[PDB]
Design a protein around this ligand. Structure first.
Ligand SMILES: [Zn+2]
Ligand SMILES: [Zn+2]
Lengths: 46, 46
């Protein structure tokens, strides 16, 4: 689970990539990707 | 992703199974399981 999903977490931390970006770039569903963005504080706050 | 994880979502809705239960019962990591409990409103509020 944290094999291919982890690398995606590092991608957001470098370019604040959105869910579609993480999912479309790596392949993880829109939910697993949103978890990365949801974890991001700078992105969490609107 | 929603193949084996889905069935687990229904398990919590029938016995409010904790993360360890969902993960230990089905096999999903502690995170994917916590997502089920986290979604539960009755369990969300402490
Ligand atoms: Zn971000
Ligand atoms: Zn519950």
């Amino acid at each position: 689970f944290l094999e291919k999903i982890e690398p995606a977490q590092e991608e957001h931390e470098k370019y604040h990539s959105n869910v579609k970006e993480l999912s479309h770039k790596f392949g993880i569903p829109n939910l697993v990707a949103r978890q990365i963005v949801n974890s991001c504080a700078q992105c969490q706050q609107k």
